């Protein structure tokens, strides 16, 4: 079938992820090129090998994991996740690194041809760096056939996410020449700066594409609460719907939740825990009573002193 | 069936004392689960992430809670241990499913409605053998989502519909939370990032959105820990006394007396031994010198320590 | 024929002064341990306690002596190790087994008698990884590495059978127990507190749960009282005073220790918290000058008074 | 004469690597002699014969790694890479180093003999040198020596070892020892084992690396040629990518020159060429599949300034 | 013969070592008692006597090793030295322990009895603490017709006297931490086994070293004294050397002082004395044998400055 | 009679160029040593040679023995490492000294012994079969210290040579390279890895800063793993015979001295002279190649080709 254009890929990412427009443009092109190459074959002349990788650099709860998973759905392609930190410091993990492929081949259902089209996301790669574990990924990225893995890994798409908390410093040290501000600094990121961070030149060489994500602002989280197709509010509204009740979040309440999430520095992943808690009591005794609609205000969220308003019929 | 969360918690009250906030959470999580299973996540134009993570000391009631939930809902229940993790390691995880079918009488549907309790998940992740356990957690994570083939008609069961509860003491988690007696308040502030820092993979945590914490030891739990386990203290001591040709007998009141004292010291299961040892120390010392048929431990011997174990001479 | 705990404690009374509670505990622990071994634990499948012991007491309280004496009384091979040497190494894990080879040496290279052996590890509190007295990664590695020994695994010997006794002073442990046992606003005495000791107290101290779980039997030693030390200076067959008198004897001189001097020595020892181990260094210093110019003089006897010891200012009385 | 001659080997290197003629000549002879020895036999003559290990000294992105990989490909020999810094610090210590032999066996299909022929490239050697780390040099040196047990074995003596390093401080010690009078390429050639001992490498380790090859820093024209000439050249790759769209991508010579200049300012070398090109064509590659034009022309004013977008031409 | 009294022992040490009067008193007693024990026997009058090995604690170049050597010399007893650092970090340390015993037998002529009366000095004991060698040292301290060594092990280490020296740089702080609620020496006098425990020495090891002595840092007046007064003083040695040439070598007091000063700047202690003197006399010793002088005079200008050559007097 | 320090240095000047300072020290050290033996005692003037490889250390030792007409023998610390699987490899060098001496006990005691690569013995062991150099210091020290058919080593003069590559650093830290070595003190050698007991036996310390041509030349041809022999083997696999003219060996040494590189700097010089040749050699077929000094010194002309 036809393959979506980078323009289209980016648009569908806008539906699941708020902001981060620059990173999505990058992913859209990197991904499009990847599959566009795979279809034409390894390469035109046998030279490129048809292997491309992406490196996501952004704060925790910025959307890295979401972006990777979302790309997979849009392209109807097997997706698996792994964590670099669980992997780091183990020898057996080099052997369980193949467990990533034994984890992907489970989700692609041993099709192999589907597995090669698949996408793999490695999280917390910055943590492994202070490198032997990195080699494991390099070997992972590469697969050869002389004519447990039937398909070479070179065809599968690798996306590697990390927070790189110290990287922002090493960037500033190199660009310390004249004659917040985190977003501007990430853009200036170069492979050499990742080397100083502790990533081996070998590993970076195979991660040519570099996308940077900004730290979610207040309004960013608010939009994340409502806009995305599977936004928290939507999810809970559906849950309350099964009870025949209508759940409504006042704008001031959503704002109230975002603020709390920023204070925790948890990012977007800490949004659920906050909402779950605000609606805990209600969801508990709701099945016992019959009301028409429930309204959540900022007072019930931030203070947690006030219970949500109940409207009957 | 499908009792309201209010009804569920009240049923938990009869089995476990205290831990009202945890009960409330389990009630909702379970209710939503089965109410959401019937309807299904599909349709309505929305998808739901949807699993519970029990965090409490040893002998707090976690396991008790899991089993009870299943009994109240007339749903097949199966327990598993993270520290057993029993080359491929793939059958280990599949067994859990198979066992669930055996208990379920081989009904594909009832097995989907089943509940599965995983213990020692905290042990798989260590802060500050290890690899076999963490690899199984990745294999375990792979069995919460997606169907699992029947063991080689082959009408297998989708693993997603099954509810998964994971219990763990998480001794080191207490510290990481405070860095990010009266520990309960710290537990409430627990967040998915604290789990990450503890050693839990992000993908796993994301699969366990619901988190329940316990702030008090469970009396019955300890009582059962004293006699039920194969390595139970009571059995260990009855064995020692048996080499002397003596018959050691614990009165139920004595066992309860032991638990209540352990709870007052917040020592937990580990603090049970020091209490039993102290109760039999004098006896064990002058036992090999005298000749009696059996010896009986009563609550008056434990709590007050005033009375010594009753001797029966023959 | 195994000795009843009554008998084991009685013979410990001959070599060790005080610590009656700890001796009762060791007596039971030991008896049960070998009682289990000799009956081959349990045929088929039954449960049996490891019976490993954790000695907790101040320096020079008798921990080492108790361990050594236990072995002698049971005519069983005995070997000592120090947890400090162990810490910090992967190579020391391979050194940990060295403990076993040494046990085999004293054991005549007999595998079964080695299984009967007793192993005492000193300064276990030192390896504990904690903020107090602040390498951590390495010390823990030993706890875990030595932990494997405790359970039991080209000698071919299995350490399960061998009895483990781990001693430590646990200087900080006293505070952590008080912080827990306290009520409202204290505790009578350290000895009274060490009794209230729980595994969770050892946990906060720095010991890992899996390790403590392998040390079920916990014995606690009291700080030897003035009168104990004093007895240790006189009563034992190789008592310090007896050794120095013998020395002064081959000089033709008679050495006399006044009771006030012996008590003066005990007090010094208690202020230094060194226990009995600190006794000799104290006596030595008090007789140093005397022994130096002794072979040059020609007197009948020398009398040690309190004033010579405590003040260290006056010289011993010389009688001609 | 079934084995490739040094002449033959260098020529093959010229296709993958641009410039560094002097280093290529040394590698060619070092390698040829190494295998020439293996085929006849090790120390067959009464006279003691020492295996020749290579030590590549050159700035980052000079071609060190590439040269090592290319050598193995020409000889149809198993090649594995390791990193001095990755192995510098490990709980397992030198035991790990053996695992690299395991890696050589993986590529090798676990053929003992083929692993012998294998080539091993160690990167960032300059890093371990200051110091218990320098002990790892000993563990790494013992490999060069040989007799390490394999997983079954593998004679590390027969295996060829190439050690690459930037040696940023080396330039100074060379000019210091000689007292000297730029001239970087001239100073590197003057390098001696004693300059490396002063750098921090143990004498026993440098003694096992008899062959020393130095690389000049890339010329302005070197980069330009690297962009165009090599079979795996960037321009060729992007042109191919743009061709899948049916579009013809063309780089103005002024543009290639513009790219090289940027790369030199970064000091990144050839490695930083792709990041520069990627950024220039990023926007165009994003919205290209949405529009239909015959060709795109990349000029220097679109690269350097990044101000103007590429020229779009509609073919008819 | 008769055993030398501690009084005698100390006086003999006074001739080879300057100062450290306190340490010498200690060593004198420890040594006397030790050999007085061997002659009488391990057991005396129904009571077992305690072996009194010695631990020397002093700065580098203070006289620890010399003290050890000198003791052996005045007792006419076999002496061997060993270094704790060579042993550590290896499994073959235990074998090297036997190597030390072998060394003692060599100088001893392989006379087992003479070897058991010998003395062994272990240097840099402080370096071994942050310990398995402490276990090996402990065991060694405790005691346990053929041209070859045959029964080399017929000798047990029980009888041998072990002296352990160390600078213990960190020990000075550990002692201060317990006192709080030359000048360094006053801190070292208060040293207790407990302090050595904290330093890294295992309790079982310190219990085998019941005798502890301390040395003071060497003052400038001390170095000057060392240059002239000992029996084997540097000045005396060179004077004897110049004496073979029929020349009289004279050191002016200001010169001896100049040497000391220079020695203190290098902080080598008495060790760096010889190298300073040899350099000052090198040129002179080189061209001496080819000229006829009555005597040669070394002034401070010749030593410290090195600018002027020694004064040459003709006869 | 006995040669004056003046006479001894003069005889050393004819064998080794430069190193005037070390030659003085050795002269006095040796003179005093034998002057103390003569006329009887009434005792260690042992020497420690610190200099780069190819500096003349070994040559100076030999030369001192010949002018004194005294038995001489060399030993290698590296070889003495193992000290033999059984026994002392050390006692072997006293036997060698006696053989050269015809087994005359006295002449042996007058003898001179040179131990090379002492800096190598100083110290993860990783259960290595090879003996620890730290222990070798002891085995070597047992030798220096007199024993007790029977020979006492106290009377024999010991000279220990070494490069001490790391020593230059240690001395700069304690506070160019030539002037630094002059400031060497026993403390530096202890920090290097030499035990205080060993250093105490080596009171005299001499330093060499420049290389000697004769030594370099010898190192190029004599050793069994000599550069010339290695390259000849290489060219031999090609069926070609490689011949180094003596004038070319001398030309190589000069180059190495001018660059103060030392022995390890020789290979880089030879490699550059033969690079082109080895590069296009496998393409042509000739009987032999001849390297002359004009190939080396000027690099002007290419080596001679015989077909
Ligand atoms: N920009 C965004 N728009 C919509 N949802 C988001 C966004 N960022 C994060 N989320 C939501 O929050 C959760 C955590 O985000 P995540 O992808 O883990 O960020 P990171 O990868 O940086 O940790 C996701 O499950 C996702 O649904
Ligand atoms: N209770 C005791 N009875 C007899 N002797 C003792 C006692 N406590 C200590 N000692 C003496 O002190 C020495 C060391 O005691 P030790 O067992 O090491 O105490 P700890 O183990 O607490 O350090 C012994 O050799 C012994 O003679
Ligand atoms: N001399 C060269 N000629 C052609 N391409 C080069 C050259 N040097 C580097 N490159 C390119 O740059 C990238 C990295 O080069 P690399 O071999 O890693 O140099 P180094 O080893 O010094 O880092 C490669 O992908 C390669 O295509
Ligand atoms: N107090 C002293 N009196 C005389 N000579 C000394 C004294 N201290 C050191 N020396 C001299 O210095 C040299 C080294 O002393 P040594 O005892 O080895 O140092 P350390 O105290 O570190 O063991 C010896 O050769 C000795 O002659
Ligand atoms: Mg140079
Ligand atoms: Mg001296």
UniProtKB/Swiss-Prot annotation, chain B:
Keyword terms, alphabetized: ATP-binding, Chaperone, Host-virus interaction, Metal-binding, Nucleotide-binding, Stress response, Zinc
GO molecular function: ATP binding; ATP hydrolysis activity; ATP-dependent peptidase activity; ATP-dependent protein folding chaperone; disordered domain specific binding; identical protein binding; protease binding; protein dimerization activity
UniProt keyword Chaperone, yes or no: yes
Cofactors, names only: Zn(2+)
Gene inactivation effect: Delayed and decreased induction of the extracytoplasmic-stress response.
Nucleotide-binding found in the keyword field: yes
Entry superkingdom: Bacteria
One GO BP: proteolysis involved in protein catabolic process
Sites where the protein binds ATP: 57-64
Cofactor note (record): Binds 1 Zn(2+) ion per subunit.
Induction of synthesis: By heat shock. Part of the clpP-clpX operon, clpX can be expressed individually from its own promoter.
Disulfide bond annotation, renumbered to this chain: none
A cellular component term, taken from the record's GO annotations: endopeptidase Clp complex
Subunit structure: Component of the ClpX-ClpP complex. Forms a hexameric ring that, in the presence of ATP, binds to fourteen ClpP subunits assembled into a disk-like structure with a central cavity, resembling the structure of eukaryotic proteasomes. Interacts with Mu phage DDE-recombinase A; this interaction remodels the viral transpososome for replication.
Protein family according to the UniProt entry: Belongs to the ClpX chaperone family.
Protein role: ATP-dependent specificity component of the Clp protease. Uses cycles of ATP binding and hydrolysis to unfold proteins and translocate them to the ClpP protease. It directs the protease to specific substrates both with and without the help of adapter proteins such as SspB. Participates in the final steps of RseA-sigma-E degradation, liberating sigma-E to induce the extracytoplasmic-stress response. It may bind to the lambda O substrate protein and present it to the ClpP protease in a form that can be recognized and readily hydrolyzed by ClpP.
Protein name: ATP-dependent Clp protease ATP-binding subunit ClpX
Gene that produces this protein: clpX
Residue range from the parent sequence: 63 to 414 of 424
Curated annotation (Swiss-Prot), chain F:
Cofactor-binding details, from the entry: Binds 1 Zn(2+) ion per subunit.
Record flagged with keyword Nucleus: no
Inducing stimuli: By heat shock. Part of the clpP-clpX operon, clpX can be expressed individually from its own promoter.
GO cellular component: cytosol; endopeptidase Clp complex; HslUV protease complex
Transmembrane residue ranges: none
Gene Ontology biological process terms from the UniProt entry: cell division; protein denaturation; protein unfolding; proteolysis involved in protein catabolic process
Disruption phenotype: Delayed and decreased induction of the extracytoplasmic-stress response.
Cofactors (names): Zn(2+)
Keywords for the protein's UniProt record, in alphabetical order: ATP-binding, Chaperone, Host-virus interaction, Metal-binding, Nucleotide-binding, Stress response, Zinc
Keyword Zinc attached: yes
One MF annotation (Gene Ontology) recorded for this entry: disordered domain specific binding
Residues bound to ATP: 52-59
Protein family: Belongs to the ClpX chaperone family.
Complexes and interactors: Component of the ClpX-ClpP complex. Forms a hexameric ring that, in the presence of ATP, binds to fourteen ClpP subunits assembled into a disk-like structure with a central cavity, resembling the structure of eukaryotic proteasomes. Interacts with Mu phage DDE-recombinase A; this interaction remodels the viral transpososome for replication.
Its job: ATP-dependent specificity component of the Clp protease. Uses cycles of ATP binding and hydrolysis to unfold proteins and translocate them to the ClpP protease. It directs the protease to specific substrates both with and without the help of adapter proteins such as SspB. Participates in the final steps of RseA-sigma-E degradation, liberating sigma-E to induce the extracytoplasmic-stress response. It may bind to the lambda O substrate protein and present it to the ClpP protease in a form that can be recognized and readily hydrolyzed by ClpP.
Protein's name according to its UniProt entry: ATP-dependent Clp protease ATP-binding subunit ClpX
Organism: Escherichia coli (strain K12)
Record lineage: Bacteria, Pseudomonadati, Pseudomonadota, Gammaproteobacteria, Enterobacterales
Primary gene name: clpX
Full-protein residues shown: 63 to 413 of 424
């Amino acid at each position: 079938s036809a393959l979506p254009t980078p323009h289209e890929i980016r648009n569908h990412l806008d539906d699941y992820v708020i902001g981060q427009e620059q990173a999505k443009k990058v992913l859209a092109v990197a991904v499009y090129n990847h599959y566009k190459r795979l279809r034409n074959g390894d390469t035109s002349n046998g030279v490129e090998l048809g292997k491309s990788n992406i490196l996501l650099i952004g704060p925790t709860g910025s959307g890295k994991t979401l972006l990777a998973e979302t790309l997979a759905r849009l392209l109807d392609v097997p997706f698996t996740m792994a964590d670099a930190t669980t992997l780091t410091e183990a020898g057996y993990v080099g052997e369980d690194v193949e467990n990533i492929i034994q984890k992907l081949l489970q989700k692609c259902d041993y099709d192999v041809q589907k597995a090669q089209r698949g996408i793999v996301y490695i999280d917390q790669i910055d943590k492994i760096s202070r490198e032997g574990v990195q080699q494991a990924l390099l070997k992972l990225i590469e697969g050869t056939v002389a004519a447990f893995l039937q398909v070479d890994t070179s065809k599968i798409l690798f996306i590697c996410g990390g927070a790189f908390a110290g990287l922002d410093k090493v960037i500033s040290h190199r660009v310390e020449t004249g004659s917040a501000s985190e977003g501007e600094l990430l853009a200036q990121v170069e492979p050499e700066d990742l080397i100083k961070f502790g990533l081996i030149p070998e590993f970076i060489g195979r991660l040519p594409v570099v996308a940077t994500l900004n730290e979610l602002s207040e309004e960013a989280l608010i939009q994340i609460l409502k806009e995305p197709k599977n936004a928290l509010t939507k999810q809970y509204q559906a849950l309350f719907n099964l009870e025949g009740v209508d759940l409504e979040f006042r704008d001031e309440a959503l704002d109230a939740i975002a603020k709390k999430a920023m204070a925790r520095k948890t990012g977007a992943r800490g949004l659920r825990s906050i909402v779950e808690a605000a609606l805990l009591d209600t969801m508990y005794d709701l099945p016992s009573m019959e009301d028409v609609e429930k309204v959540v205000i900022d007072e019930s969220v931030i203070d947690g002193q006030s219970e949500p308003l109940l409207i009957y019929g």
